[PDB]
Amino acid sequence: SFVEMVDNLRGKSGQGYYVEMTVGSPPQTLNILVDTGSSNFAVGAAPHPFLHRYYQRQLSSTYRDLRKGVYVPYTQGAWAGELGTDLVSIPHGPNVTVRANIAAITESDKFFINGSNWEGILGLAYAEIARPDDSLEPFFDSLVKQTHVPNLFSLQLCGAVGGSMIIGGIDHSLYTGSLWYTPIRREWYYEVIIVRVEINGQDLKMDCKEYNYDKSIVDSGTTNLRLPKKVFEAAVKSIKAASSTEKFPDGFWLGEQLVCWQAGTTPWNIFPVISLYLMGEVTNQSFRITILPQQYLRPVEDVATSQDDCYKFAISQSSTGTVMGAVIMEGFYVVFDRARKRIGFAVSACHVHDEFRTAAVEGPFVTLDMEDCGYN
Ligand SMILES: C[C@@]1(N)Cc2cccc(c2)/C=C\C(c2ccccc2)=N\C(=O)c2cc(cc(-c3ccccc3C#N)c2)COC1=O
């Protein structure tokens, strides 16, 4: 029944998944980045070199200036704008219209991406991390309070881009196998708990507290699988050992160097699979999501339809905890079940795989003392 929401996401390889959103009156449709790592709805509202279009508040009769500024600094980039509210709809999303808070971005630094084709960002996380503070109600909260749309959305990000953002439910055609759920530990970022990490079936053997030191979150707006320094180092040592058939320069594993292969010759088979075990919904029960090199090895903006496929190792370090970005999400259909405070994972019907291996979601496994893996 959610068919009209299927394939409502677009994007350029490595630049961000976006959905169309129509704001104001008369209608002003813009391409908006789907971001589960933040909670502010904001759109470019002034000309910018990297922006094809922008929000023109003076042309919207329903726009209400809140007479207050807002500044938002992200892990990457930042912007400044004016707060206000206007009518908002998602053409290929739920059949409703709501009055939501909207930040009109007038200035920014290293936020927008040249050629990405998106002009704003939809922060889908909770109010706790919204700017200026948690009193600025996020878009999804307004949606649920003003309409009968169920408190849940799901994301199918298809990498090389496109995908689907199903709002108010789950579309069975977007995944195979069963959906496995992990609890949302706290409602601020979409925080989860990783209890075990394996490289080609081999346990990384680190104290699970290190996997979530600070926190572990799911962010559709982050490209890589980012890991805490100590975890990153151990993971890389293990991945290098498992892919010893061919040697690569140190810089490759640091994302400083790229390696290209003749079209259709990338030796996926020499790279290991990576499994992250997440806390399940029942005591001492966990499940695992497994990604292939096709997920963690990202394609880089082609030179011009050349006979060379260049890739970048998309697993990198973080000083603010684990971030399960696009590298993780592209292999699965992810359900953000806000209503039941849980996130579900299932094999995506569009994840890129080969004839030898496939991304997977498997369970259940017995894992004790999972509660002690979270940071307080
Ligand atoms: C909350 C927010 N998600 C906001 C945000 C900030 C800056 C840019 C974007 C979004 C645009 C979309 C984009 C994507 C997303 C999926 C697919 C393709 C591109 N992401 C990036 O480009 C991006 C985003 C972030 C860190 C690095 C980043 C920085 C340094 C080292 C490694 C990195 C990675 N990964 C790169 C931190 O993300 C955020 O703060």
Assign 3-state DSSP to the chain and report helix, strand, coil percentages, each to 5: 15, 40, 45
Q: Which residues are CB-neighbours of 222 under 8 A, at least 6 positions away?
A: 37, 75, 323, 325, 326
Gap from CA of 221 to ligand 1 centroid (Å): 5
Question: Selecting from 2.40.70.10, 1.10.760.10, 3.40.50.300, 3.40.50.450, what CATH number does the domain 17-149 have?
Answer: 2.40.70.10
- Is 123 within 8 Å of 41 (Cβ atoms)? yes
| Cα 253 from Cα 275, distance rounded (Å) | 18
Q: How far from the centroid of its chain's Cα atoms is residue 102's Cα?
A: 21
Q: How far from the centroid of its chain's Cα atoms is residue 219's Cα?
A: 4
Residue 171 annotated in active site: no
| Cα 289 from Cα 298, distance rounded (Å) | 19
Residue whose CA is closest, atom 2 of ligand 1?
A: 221
- Is 325 within 8 Å of 74 (Cβ atoms)? no
Phi, psi of 117 (to 5 degrees): 80, 10
Q: Where in the chain is the domain with CATH 2.40.70.10?
A: 17-149, 150-376
- Is 223 within 8 Å of 325 (Cβ atoms)? yes
Q: Which of 222, 330, 334 to mutate to test the pocket of ligand 1 (most atoms within 8 A of CB)?
A: 222
- Write the single-letter amino acid at 305: T
Q: Which residue ranges have their beta carbon within 6 Å of ligand 1? A: 14-16, 33, 35, 37-38, 74-77, 111, 219, 221-224, 226, 316, 325-326
| Cα 136 from Cα 356, distance rounded (Å) | 49
Name the nearest CA neighbour of 122 among 162, 155, 158. Answer: 155
Q: How far from the centroid of its chain's Cα atoms is residue 64's Cα?
A: 31
Beta-bridge partners for 110: none
Tell me how the structure was determined.
X-ray
Torsion of CA 374, 281, 336, 188, to 10 degrees: -30
Name the nearest CA neighbour of 313 among 260, 371, 252, 246. Answer: 252
Q: How far from the centroid of its chain's Cα atoms is residue 80's Cα?
A: 23
Expressed in Å, this structure's resolution amounts to 1.8
Among 35, 86, 141, 337, the one annotated catalytic: 35
Sign of the C-alpha dihedral computed for residues 101, 107, 113 and 115 taken in this order: positive
Question: Selecting from 2.40.70.10, 3.30.360.10, 2.30.30.700, 2.10.240.10, what CATH number does the domain 150-376 have?
Answer: 2.40.70.10
Tell me the CA distances in angstroms from 310 to 7, 66, 291, 326, 358, one per residue in order.
Answer: 27, 47, 20, 18, 22
Q: What is the DSSP letter of 212?
A: T
Name the nearest CA neighbour of 234 among 196, 286, 280. Answer: 196
| Cα 230 from Cα 86, distance rounded (Å) | 45
Q: Which residues are CB-neighbours of 20 under 8 A, at least 6 positions away?
A: 8, 29, 30, 31, 32, 90, 91, 92
Peptide bond into 132 cis (omega under 30): yes
Q: Which two tokens stand for residue 309?
A: 């496929």
| Cα 86 from Cα 102, distance rounded (Å) | 7
Q: Which two tokens stand for residue 58?
A: 């003076």
Name the nearest CA neighbour of 215 among 127, 341, 320. Answer: 320
- Write the single-letter amino acid at 87: L
| Tokens 């090199």 found at | 293
| Cα 64 from Cα 77, distance rounded (Å) | 27
Phi/psi zone of residue 261: left (φ > 0), alpha (ψ -120 to 50 degrees), beta?
Answer: beta
Gap from CA of 98 to ligand 1 centroid (Å): 28
Name the nearest CA neighbour of 222 among 309, 316, 300. Answer: 316
Gap from CA of 285 to ligand 1 centroid (Å): 32
Residue 219 annotated in active site: yes
- Is 295 within 8 Å of 372 (Cβ atoms)? no
Name the nearest CA neighbour of 300 among 290, 287, 309, 288. Answer: 309
Work out the burial of residue 220: count CB atoms within 10 Å of its CB; fewer than 13 is exposed, 13-18 middle, 19 or more buried: buried
Q: How many CA atoms lie within 13 A of 367 on its CB side?
A: 24
Q: How far from the centroid of its chain's Cα atoms is residue 96's Cα?
A: 25
| Cα 51 from Cα 151, distance rounded (Å) | 32
| Cα 6 from Cα 113, distance rounded (Å) | 25
| Three-state secondary structure of 112-136 | CCCCCCCCEEEECCCHHHCCCCCCC
